[PDB]
């Protein structure tokens, strides 16, 4: 699994792979690792699929109830904290979840990392999963606040590609999202097989690979 998310001038980019593995067997080629909590909130998934789906869908219930009680959207900060507190109830019980809560609120764009230990971190850029190290390499060298929406979408897409190539437990396809103040915008499903060859030719990268 490789997931990433980063803030920038025009909001936040969210990119994930789609591979699911059961040992060395590739169980799923196309797993949706993003959850649409609301039109302005996203959640990534890494670790146990069951845990990620259940607890983030339960977060969506609790974020929806917040809107009904208060007549107002929940903040990214408050949503991330509700989730971390859920993880803290099943402390040491063996849950495996690594997630980034991405959204736009009154403070502007928001991005929080949350995991099964209960860790909750605010930040500009995060990456989770078995292939996060490969993604960080591309992100750290090419990231700027002054990125355009077009270039930012490509950076997240290219960073997942880097991980999908090297990491055996990452791959399948790339799902892209862009979060604005008018809500999140889905930027499609991109097969890695086709994307790899395309990027190789256009960018000139992956010279060592033959095609």
């Amino acid at each position: 699994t490789t997931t990433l998310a980063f803030k920038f001038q025009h909001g936040v980019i969210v990119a994930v792979d789609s591979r699911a593995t059961a040992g060395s067997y590739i169980s799923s080629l196309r797993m949706n690792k993003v959850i649409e909590i609301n039109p302005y909130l996203l959640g990534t998934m890494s670790g146990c699929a069951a845990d990620c789906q259940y607890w983030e869908r339960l977060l969506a219930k609790e974020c929806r109830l917040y809107y009904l009680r208060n007549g107002e959207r929940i903040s990214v900060s408050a949503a991330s904290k509700l989730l971390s507190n859920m993880m803290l109830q099943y402390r040491g019980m063996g849950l495996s979840m690594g997630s980034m809560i991405c959204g736009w609120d009154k403070k502007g764009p928001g991005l929080y990392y949350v995991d099964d230990n209960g860790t909750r971190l605010s930040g500009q850029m995060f990456s989770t999963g078995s292939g996060n190290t490969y993604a960080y390499g591309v992100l750290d060298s090419n990231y700027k606040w002054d990125l355009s929406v077009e270039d930012a979408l490509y950076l997240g897409k290219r960073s997942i590609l880097a991980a999908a190539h090297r990491d055996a437990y990452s791959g399948g396809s790339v799902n892209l999202y862009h979060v604005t103040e008018d809500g999140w915008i889905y930027h499609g499903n991109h097969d890695v097989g086709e994307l790899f060859w395309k990027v190789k030719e256009e960018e000139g990268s992956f010279n060592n690979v033959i095609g």
């Binding site: 930040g123 990456s127 996060n132 190290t133």
Partner: peptide, 13 residues
């Protein structure tokens, strides 16, 4: 620093 697995997630905690 905050580390998860083999990666440093944050350097301003």
């Amino acid at each position: 620093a905050v580390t998860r697995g083999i990666s440093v997630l944050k350097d301003s905690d």
